[PDB]
């Protein structure tokens, strides 16, 4: 297990989201969406969710795993709607 803070796009609050050190940015973004999409953010089937480090802005590859992105536990990540 590895904890990160989810700052989902269009939402109002950053939240705690447990992920796995094996997950990929895609799977991380899926675990984050669970706590935002359909709760207080309208879905967007016509788009893709990306994961980027909130501090420096770095955008991570969809298939890259949590364990490779380094990241500090509780690190804040922006989950955004793209293509």
């Amino acid at each position: 297990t590895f904890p990160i803070m989810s700052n989902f796009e269009r939402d109002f609050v950053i939240q705690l989201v447990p992920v796995d050190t094996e997950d990929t940015m895609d799977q991380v973004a899926e675990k984050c969406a669970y706590h935002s999409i359909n709760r207080r953010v309208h879905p967007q089937p016509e788009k893709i969710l990306r994961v980027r480090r909130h501090e420096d802005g770095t955008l991570f590859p969809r298939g890259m795993i949590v364990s490779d992105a380094g990241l500090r536990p509780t690190e804040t990540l922006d989950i955004i709607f793209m293509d």
Partner: protein, 491 residues
């Protein structure tokens, strides 16, 4: 015949003397006194604007309670609380639980000045202020006590501050920082000047008005009376600040005011803002939370800061801006996480209310209105389960409140993270992170609810476990104030 007060008052505060059997620093330890190099003789120029003697005090305060307690007993069996608007009832439960014991704790904060202030006049005034907060703590226990048989929530008037429920942690974070762990001079500034003179003196005035508008005369009488005492002892910070600027400590004075005001603001954004923009019935809303702040709080701070030779805090404009967002974020957080507080949060997002919000905050529905849209649809379509959380929100490591901001179209939520001595901290604003950095040794090893959760200090490590950890059980656990009555307006 009797002497005129002015003829002898000075003697009541002619109490400083030169220690001989112990040293001045032993008698007035810096960590408690905070004389900051200023001489005893220099602190003696302290001159309270509102003077009062023992005989006047006991006589006047006797009549204040005679009236307040008489009002309460006369309306007691009337049981207004049973027909009052749930938003109001919730307003009172939140008020008592969050403040009753902090009022009592303030008497110790006053006792700190009464004992360690080098300014003789500050010591006597603090003795009276100590007595005021003793009254405030007691009277705000006696009054809610009348409703313990109506709901367990009223028990939190006494229990709240003894728990680790998040709002309680937030309150203790503020109060302990501002008044329980500061030297005497620091308390007079951060507490009486920044918080009381700056926020509560006026807030209570508005609170008493709303209580009257709500039909709760017992509560209106309560708040009005308390307010008159505050208006009196809140004066202590002014002279302290003059003396500091008057000497070579304008920076230190400035820094304390900046910290104190921001922290007071944060707490204020979660406890008061939501109440007037969402809990008070639409027809009983004089002005918006933002209007109230500008017309009664911000102009006064500038006024005061000018007369003292101080400057507006470096975060003043941001603060001005945040009046359009912050409290909306706090309200949404509290409402969505309603089972984690001890009162029933009112949604306040019905059609009528939603335009009032757009009227007072142009761009609301475009942003905040979005999150509420989803929540509304889910309720309309039988999916309540999606209107309550399954995780914890990120908590600020300074104000211990959720990190939230503008959602929807104009999305702009940010986290001013900071890594210090191998640990990652989260802050809901630039100012929150600054408060920490200018004095890290003061907050370094503290842990907010989330930190504790992540450290395994909350077991079982799940929602049900977090709830027990916060001492919350069904009956006191919060839900929608009007039991989702406002949903019918949406088909």
């Amino acid at each position: 015949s009797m002497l005129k007060r002015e003829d002898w008052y000075d003697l009541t505060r002619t109490t400083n003397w030169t220690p001989k059997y112990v040293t001045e620093n032993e008698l007035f330890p810096e960590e408690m006194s905070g004389a900051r190099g200023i001489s005893m003789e220099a602190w003696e120029k302290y001159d309270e604007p509102y003077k009062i003697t023992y005989p006047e005090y006991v006589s006047i305060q006797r009549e204040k309670d005679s009236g307040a307690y008489s009002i309460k007993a006369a309306l007691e069996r009337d049981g207004f609380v049973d027909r009052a608007d749930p938003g109001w009832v919730s307003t009172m439960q939140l008020h008592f639980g969050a403040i009753a014991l902090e009022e009592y704790a303030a008497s110790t904060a006053e006792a700190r000045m009464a004992r360690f202030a080098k300014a003789p006049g500050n010591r006597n005034m603090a003795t009276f202020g100590m007595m005021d907060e003793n009254r405030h703590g007691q009277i705000q226990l006696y009054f809610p006590y009348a409703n313990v048989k109506r709901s367990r929530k009223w028990d939190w008037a006494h229990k709240a501050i003894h728990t680790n429920e998040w709002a309680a942690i937030a309150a203790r974070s503020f109060f302990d920082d501002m008044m329980m762990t500061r030297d005497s001079v620091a308390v007079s500034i951060m507490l009486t000047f920044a918080f009381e003179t700056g926020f509560t003196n006026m807030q209570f005035l508005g609170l008493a008005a709303d209580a009257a508008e709500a039909g709760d005369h017992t509560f209106a009488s309560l708040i009005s009376s308390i307010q008159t005492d505050e208006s009196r002892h809140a004066q202590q910070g002014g002279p302290s600040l003059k003396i500091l600027v008057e000497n070579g400590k304008k920076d230190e004075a400035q820094q304390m005011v900046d910290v104190a005001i921001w922290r007071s603001w944060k707490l204020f954004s979660v406890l008061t803002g939501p109440i007037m923009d969402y809990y008070t019935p639409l027809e009983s809303r004089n002005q918006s939370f933002k209007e109230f702040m500008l017309e009664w709080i911000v102009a006064q701070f500038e006024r005061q800061l000018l007369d003292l030779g101080l400057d507006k805090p470096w975060y003043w404009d941001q603060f001005m801006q945040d009046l359009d967002e912050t409290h909306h974020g706090m309200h949404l957080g509290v409402w969505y996480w309603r089972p984690t507080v001890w009162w029933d949060p009112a949604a306040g997002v019905s059609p009528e209310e939603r335009e009032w919000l757009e009227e007072k905050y142009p761009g609301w529905n475009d942003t905040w209105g979005q999150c509420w849209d989803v929540i509304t649809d889910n309720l309309v379509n039988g999916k309540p389960e999606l209107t309550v959380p399954e995780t914890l929100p990120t908590i600020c490591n300074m104000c211990n409140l959720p990190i939230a901001h503008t959602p929807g179209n104009k999305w702009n939520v940010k986290d001013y993270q900071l890594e210090y001595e191998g640990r990652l901290y989260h802050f809901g604003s630039e100012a929150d992170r600054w408060c920490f950095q200018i004095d890290p040794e003061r907050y370094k090893n503290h842990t907010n609810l989330v930190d504790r959760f992540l450290k395994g200090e909350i077991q079982p490590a799940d929602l049900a476990g977090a709830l027990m950890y916060m001492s919350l059980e069904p009956g006191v656990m919060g839900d929608d104030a009007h039991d989702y009555e406002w949903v019918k307006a949406y088909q």
